[PDB]
């Protein structure tokens, strides 16, 4: 059951698409 919202698979997108590292300097 390939889930597009399965956060268990999003963990990989959070390793390179991490903007918090960007917002941590401002927000």
């Amino acid at each position: 059951e390939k889930d597009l919202l399965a956060l268990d698979k999003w963990n990989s997108l959070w390793s390179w698409f991490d903007i918090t590292k960007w917002l941590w300097y401002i927000k």
Side-chain angles (χ1 to χ4, degrees):
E1 269 193 36
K2 58 220 189 292
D3 300 307
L4 289 161
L5 274 148
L7 269 168
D8 217 72
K9 241 146 204 140
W10 276 93
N11 207 96
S12 278
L13 266 142
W14 274 124
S15 186
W16 43 284
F17 236 135
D18 225 327
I19 301 301
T20 183
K21 244 243 166 78
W22 257 59
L23 288 268
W24 209 103
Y25 251 83
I26 5 289
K27 261 212 145 271

